[PDB]
Each structure stands twice: as structure tokens, then as C-alpha cells.
User: Fold this.
Amino acid sequence: RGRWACQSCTFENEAAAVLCSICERPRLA
Amino acid sequence: RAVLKELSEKLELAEKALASKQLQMDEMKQTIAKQEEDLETMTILRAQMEVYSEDFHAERAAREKIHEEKEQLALQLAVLLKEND
Amino acid sequence: DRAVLKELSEKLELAEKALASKQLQMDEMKQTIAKQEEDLETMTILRAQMEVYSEDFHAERAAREKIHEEKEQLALQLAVLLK
Ligand SMILES: [Zn+2]
Assistant:
């Protein structure tokens, strides 16, 4: 995976996360 | 094995998120069903009462008309009394 | 055991797709809730408006009956004077 950007709030999340740490939206939502 | 440990942990995090999102969805469903019931009720109630807008306007016009007729009689009477004063 | 990692990788990807799809369903439900809340307040005010018309209609009818009585009384006074 590696890190991933939340497509709603633009925060860059850690690879281990499945929900955005800011807004709790899933990576592929 | 470290990639395997990482995958297993993330899958368990996804399974907990699936459950958490589902609980939130369950609440939203209850909200939607309650609002739908309330809206259908209010919609029926408004429709059954709609006639009163028409009847109010017709009644007001009738009231204004008879008021005008009454004021005309009052003026005729006042004139007749003053003519006899 | 690289094909085993693939297997688990496939399961995780499906879990993330199902998770994202639940979120998308939630988004639609939040929009439903917002539209319903607006429609319900609007309908509640419109029902209240019909209730005001109902009250005013009955008040106009009461006024009309009173004015009719007053007109009959004036008409009588006039009739007495003109006789
Ligand atoms: Zn976010």
C-alpha cells in the first residue's frame, strides 16, 4: 500500500490505516 | 512474514470498520424511516385542510360585501335622522 | 509464501471496496435525511398555514353572521322611521 491520500480532506494517511484519520472515510470512498 | 503480519492486521482493522460503518448506517435507516412516516402524515394533514384557503377568501369577500351593505344602511339612517333634526 | 499473501491481499482489497461502498451508501442516506428534514419543515409550516386559514375562515363566518344581524337591526329602525 504505502501511504495514501484521503480523496475528501486531502490528508496523507499511514499505510496501516483503512479509514482517514481526520474524516474517517475509507480509502476508496 | 512481516508483510503477512501487516496484511492480517489491516484486514482486521477493515473488518472492524465494516461493523462500525454498519452500526452508523443502522441509525441513519431508523432516522429515514421515522422522517418518512412523519412526512406522509403531515402531507395528508395539509391536503385535507387545503380547502380552508379557498373558503377563507370566499368568506372574507362575503363579509366585506355585507359590511358595505350594512354601512350603507347606517348612512341612510343617519341622514334621515339628521334631516329630521 | 507469496501466493498466500496474494490471497489475503485479495481479501483485504475486497474488504476495502465493501467499506468504501458502505460509505457511499451512507453519503446517499445523509442526503436523504437532509432533503426529508427540509420537506418536513416545509410541510409542517404549510399545514400550519392551512390551520391559520381555517381559524380565519371561521372568524370571518362569525363576523359575517354578526354583521347580518346588525344590518337587520338597522333595516328595522329605518322601516320604523319610514312608516
Ligand atoms: Zn479525510
Q: What stands out?
A: The helical segments of chain B are 2-49, 51-83. Chain B touches chain C through 46 residues (CB under 8 Å).
